[PDB]
Write a protein that binds this ligand. Sequence first.
Ligand code: CLA
Ligand code: CLA
Ligand code: CLA
Ligand code: CLA
Ligand code: CLA
Ligand code: CLA
Ligand code: CLA
Ligand SMILES: CCCCCCCCCCCCCCCC(=O)OC[C@H](COP(=O)(O)OC[C@@H](O)CO)OC(=O)CCCCCCCCCCCCCCC
Ligand SMILES: [Cl-]
Lengths: 73, 40, 81, 751, 78, 141
Amino acid sequence: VVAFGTPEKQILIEPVFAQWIQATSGKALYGFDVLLSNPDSIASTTGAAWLPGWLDAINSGTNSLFLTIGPGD
Amino acid sequence: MDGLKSFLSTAPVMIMALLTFTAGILIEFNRFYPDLLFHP
Amino acid sequence: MSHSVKIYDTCIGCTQCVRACPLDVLEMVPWDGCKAAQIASSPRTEDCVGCKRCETACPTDFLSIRVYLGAETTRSMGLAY
Amino acid sequence: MTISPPEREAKAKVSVDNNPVPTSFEKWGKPGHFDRTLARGPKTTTWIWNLHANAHDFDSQTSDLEDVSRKIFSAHFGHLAVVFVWLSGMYFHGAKFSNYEGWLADPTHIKPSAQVVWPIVGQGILNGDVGGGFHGIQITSGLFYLWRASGFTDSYQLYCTAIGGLVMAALMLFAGWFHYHVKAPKLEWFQNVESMMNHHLAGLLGLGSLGWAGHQIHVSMPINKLLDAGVAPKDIPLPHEFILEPSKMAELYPSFAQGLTPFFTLNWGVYSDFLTFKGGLNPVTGGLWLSDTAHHHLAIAVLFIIAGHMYRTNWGIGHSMKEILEAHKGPFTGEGHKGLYEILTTSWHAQLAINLALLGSLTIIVAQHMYAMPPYPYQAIDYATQLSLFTHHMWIGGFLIVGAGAHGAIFMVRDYDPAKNVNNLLDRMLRHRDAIISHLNWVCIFLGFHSFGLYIHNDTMRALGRPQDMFSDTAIQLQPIFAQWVQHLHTLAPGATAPNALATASYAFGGETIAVAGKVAMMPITLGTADFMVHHIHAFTIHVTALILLKGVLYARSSRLVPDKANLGFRFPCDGPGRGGTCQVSGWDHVFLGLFWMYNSLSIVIFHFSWKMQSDVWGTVSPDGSVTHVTLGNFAQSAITINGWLRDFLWAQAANVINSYGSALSAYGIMFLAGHFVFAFSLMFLFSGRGYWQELIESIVWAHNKLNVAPAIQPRALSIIQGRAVGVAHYLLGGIVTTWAFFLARSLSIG
Amino acid sequence: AQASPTTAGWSLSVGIIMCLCNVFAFVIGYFAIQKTGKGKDLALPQLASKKTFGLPELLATMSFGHILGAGMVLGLAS
Amino acid sequence: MTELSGQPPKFGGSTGGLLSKANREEKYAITWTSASEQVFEMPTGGAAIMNEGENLLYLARKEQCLALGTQLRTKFKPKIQDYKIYRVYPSGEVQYLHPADGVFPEKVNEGREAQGTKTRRIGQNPEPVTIKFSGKAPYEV
Ligand code: CLA
Ligand code: CLA
Ligand code: CLA
Ligand code: CLA
Ligand code: CLA
Ligand code: CLA
Ligand code: CLA
Ligand SMILES: CCCCCCCCCCCCCCCC(=O)OC[C@H](COP(=O)(O)OC[C@@H](O)CO)OC(=O)CCCCCCCCCCCCCCC
Ligand SMILES: [Cl-]
């Protein structure tokens, strides 16, 4: 489909499950708002001393901590 | 005759005939309705 | 050295293994376990090369003659030098 | 009792059976009839594969040499029918689906195109703009050039050729049916080798080139002379108008005024107007001179017609081939050729091996001759056409050669009689095959070390920053001195050793740089250290292929390991794990390995050709005359290392195939990936073994039994020999398709 | 600057060259042909040296004579 | 065993014959009586001529002698079932090998002792774990 000059007809499956897992650990990029990606969550309202640093690391696109994924992945 | 029928009914003739029928179906369906990546 | 050639009690005495053997490893000896009243024997396994022609020939449901390859000698390696 | 003609014996050596095989359709409905082992019934899926493997094995089907000969004759007829259908389809697509007339009107500013893709699922992008508003796939077969050389002008002539090709195919088909079922020639008829040879040299080759010389003089040459002058194809009279108006022939060639009298009175010189010997190329079109080719075909007709008289048939004069064979025997060869006439008249595989060898060699010769002496108009301008035809004829020749080795081995297994071969050539070669094969092995090792080893030395020296220690024209030179000397002799031939030749036979040996349009048609092809190394690589690979195949033939009967191999047959997997393991001892397996090695050799040959022509030949000439080659003359310094071939040849020139997406050449990149895939796929069959696959089939069959879907024809893993056949077939297909895509994309992208 | 061919056959090309080559070819054929008289078609009353030993021998040696003669004519013609 | 007689077959020579092993290690001999001078296939490549009467031939291996023996007994008009095969050592010692008791092994014969016999099926061999840390395999017990 890309050879014939029509790359818009690609079957591109979004890896929704791994993105959702990333969200559960705090990755807000996808907007799933589940567990550590939701401030109201009981999993995130614990006062865990690691949570601010873990979120700050996992939500900056400057490292290899849960690299953003797409149909290629 | 019966031998010609038994030959035209052999496995390669029948499998190529069915493959041709299915290819015609798919090619024509994509001719009149192309680019169906998914259902609306 | 040599390979090991065993003959089991499912032998029907058809002798096809002896005819297949290209090195005269096998013989037919009298027996009473089958109708043919004969069983295959391997009295010269020191000449056996292990080409498995006997096993190819055996008709019984899984072979009644079995060749287990063992220690390699110049006779068993089919060497002419 | 079908259609019975009178007789047609003509009081000749004809002897036929009136109706041995009756016509019926029932054996069509019984697949496997020709083999006793298959007529019973398929119990395992192996029966299926065998049904295709023994289809043409007529020897294993029947013991009557006469029936085998009749089968082969009728199958030859059916094969000619298939080829006639193919050629007629070519002419039909050129007639009704090609821009042949638009191309003829302006060949320089247009590209040869046939086959229009149907616009669907986006494949309509494959209809690239070839010129004059025409959109299609560009063809590299060079059909348009052969057609312009023949004298074609209208699509209706090509359509008539296509209709005639269909009719000729029907003729060949009916002839095969009639000569196998009705009048079937006896065995005694095929064994007249003197008669057959006289006819083939005189009637097939001689009369063929005679008739084609007639057509070239009457149709090709005048139309091509009018095309080269620019009279335009719509204004040139039809070919028959030159026969109906001999004044029109005299106005183009005044020699036609004097009539046939110079021929009958041996006054041939006045025929200089159309019987010429110029030598070089046409300045307007870059091809060979059609008058030179007409004179050539005329002399070839003369030579072949004369040669068709040496052998004796019914009238006493001639030669007995058995006599000539039996006469030749010396102090080194005992009885020489005593017994060869008998095996070359009762064994089909012997003739087949000889003929495959010579035909493959001849096709390689055809590639190497047609590239440097472009016989067709505007052929050398199209580097894609040139490269494509070259590599195609190369591959065909190599395959025919591998088949020659195969059928030599088959003859040895099936038709060898030791009583009929006592102390002759065959006997003594079998008696010193150890000497032969050991020396060929040593030559192969010496060639591998002294060709590829030079490349490895150069890679290591260059990597270490030691260019002065390399093998190259600028360091340790390895000059192809003898080839350079022969090139120089060729250059000086016209006017000296070739007085009546105006120009050199091929400008690849030297001379001016003949250029048509913006591109260079042909120019001298210099030879240096890199050429030396590549040529010795060619020598090495050809010698290794010959080693494998010759060993396969010479030991197909026996070896020190397997002394009774002749009883095992031509084609068998092994003779056990014993004796250390005896895998691939058969002649068939030697053919199997020789296939890979011929692929290796020919891949290197075509890579050498492509790179050398892109570096030191093809290019653009300026109005000043400056030649800018396709890849800027990079061969001499890059083709001396393997990294040079990986970077400047493969990696560099692969840029067109990979970026072909979204363009008309995208199918080439697709087939590129496809060839890579099939090559990788073959490695599963070649690297594994039947036992694993059968055991896996066991569990899959158990799962079928669980749901009661097990088939009555039990699934069996591919046989050992079949595993290898699948492996080699897919290896060759994948690799050749990869390089087909690579070559076509690269050559079409460089304009 | 091609090969000149005598200009017209008249008396020199024929007889003096062609007939002589045919005669000498007939001599060498009568001297060296193995199966002299056994063709499917036989020869009419022998007498001289033309159809004395078979139509096949005569025809083959006349063909060879014309080969020799064409060679001679074209060669000496310069 | 004693001495071996017979005439060498008519043959001009091959590269496939005996090597250093024949003198250094062991060799094999096959004798047979032929009714006439007839051509046969040499197991080492080529065609040889056997003579009427007795013929002795020296080969490199026992399998080569047995292949020649099968060819003699299967490919000749009056079949030759008379060939005897011996193992020849460089000490001059000759050892009669085939056919063992004067009778081809394909057919039964009295006075033959069974060897390699196993009084059970294949599926009745013991488990290797039951015999590990011995030196035996399940077929050797
Ligand atoms: C093997 C996996 C695979 C899958 C997932 C797809 C999927 C798809 N491809 Mg693709 N393709 C593949 C392999 C695959 N392809 C390969 C190997 C190639 C190389 C040859 C291609 C090359 C390719 C091209 C060139 C194109 C596609 C296109 C398409 C799309 C067209 C679908 C369509 O409408 O067709 C037909 C739709 C149908 C419904 C046909 C079925 C009709 C049946 C016969 C009737 C049955 C109905 C039944 C009676 C109803 C009963 C209901 C029941 C409840 C009672 C589709 C989403 C097209 C596209 O544009 O993509 C968007 C297109 O142009 N593919
Ligand atoms: C109503 C609009 C329409 C129009 C404008 C066309 C136009 C065209 N069609 Mg199409 N087609 C249509 C409807 C239409 N079709 C429908 C509704 C179907 C679904 C059944 C098809 C399925 C179809 C096929 C399979 C083929 C065409 C083909 C063709 C072309 C040749 C016509 C012909 O009869 O030659 C010859 C016709 C045929 C060879 C097949 C006739 C099609 C019938 C309906 C199906 C028969 C196939 C058979 C049941 C199973 C295949 C086995 C095989 C050995 C035949 C033509 C330009 C042919 C083509 O593309 O040429 C290369 C062709 O192969 N069409
Ligand atoms: C109506 C025509 C007709 C009929 C019914 C028969 C009948 C028969 N032929 Mg015969 N024959 C024919 C035409 C015909 N033939 C032609 C045209 C030729 C010239 C090539 C021959 C030459 C010939 C030979 C040499 C032999 C037979 C044999 C046989 C018998 C074996 C059955 C068989 O062929 O298996 C089934 C065959 C098929 C289903 C054919 C499938 C297509 C094959 C695989 C390839 C097609 C290539 C094609 C022929 C080439 C031209 C095609 C091109 C125009 C596209 C059978 C009774 C064989 C025999 O004696 O049996 C022991 C045999 O050796 N025939
Ligand atoms: C001058 C006489 C003559 C000619 C023209 C041929 C020609 C041919 N023979 Mg034949 N042959 C002859 C005499 C002749 N033979 C005799 C006397 C014998 C008995 C010993 C044989 C026995 C023999 C065998 C055993 C075989 C052949 C085969 C062949 C074909 C293989 C070559 C090929 O494929 O090239 C290219 C093919 C072509 C160009 C096909 C066109 C030629 C047509 C069919 C005949 C010419 C038409 C006719 C002469 C009138 C047209 C010319 C006129 C208008 C001026 C070939 C067409 C092989 C075969 O069967 O091939 C199918 C084969 O197996 N020949
Ligand atoms: C080193 C010696 C030598 C060499 C170089 C060749 C090489 C060649 N031979 Mg030759 N052959 C040889 C020895 C040799 N042969 C001897 C000693 C004899 C006497 C028995 C023959 C008799 C022989 C014949 C009768 C023919 C050849 C033909 C050929 C050419 C085949 C080309 C081809 O396959 O294309 C395509 C094939 C063809 C155009 C014609 C195919 C002819 C048939 C199919 C093959 C021969 C059938 C065979 C004689 C049947 C009888 C054998 C047995 C069943 C009794 C080829 C170049 C053929 C040829 O055309 O010569 C120019 C051919 O007609 N050979
Ligand atoms: C004039 C040439 C010629 C002749 C007439 C023969 C004749 C014969 N050969 Mg031989 N051979 C040839 C060329 C020739 N071959 C070449 C060029 C090679 C090198 C590859 C061989 C190597 C060879 C071997 C190794 C063997 C034979 C065998 C045979 C015999 C069985 C025929 C057969 O294969 O069954 C039917 C044919 C087939 C099943 C072929 C189909 C499979 C092909 C290879 C697939 C190719 C795919 C296609 C080209 C490209 C891919 C497209 C795909 C996706 C559709 C037969 C008498 C066999 C034999 O037993 O000898 C007695 C055998 O063992 N030949
Ligand atoms: C890159 C892959 C590769 C290589 C290098 C080889 C190597 C070789 N093949 Mg082989 N082959 C291959 C792929 C390869 N094969 C594949 C895929 C197949 C399956 C089809 C085969 C099947 C095959 C067959 C059937 C045969 C060969 C043959 C040969 C030998 C030819 C003689 C020769 O070239 O002299 C020697 C060349 C070399 C050893 C290449 C390396 C030399 C380097 C440059 C020098 C090394 C310097 C020094 C020694 C390094 C020492 C390091 C130090 C620490 C000790 C050769 C050793 C033929 C043969 O045996 O000919 C006699 C033969 O019969 N091959
Ligand atoms: C640059 C070329 C380099 C090669 C020169 C050295 C030649 C090597 C072998 C010497 C003898 C062969 C020459 C006499 C040719 C010849 O026939 O000699 C004569 C003799 C047989 O001749 P007869 O007297 O028997 O002639 C009667 C014939 O009708 C026999 O049927 O041949 C032999 O003695 C057998 C050995 C030949 C096999 C040796 C070939 C080895 C392969 C070497 C390949 C080199 C490549 C050459 C390049 C094309
Ligand atoms: Cl480099």
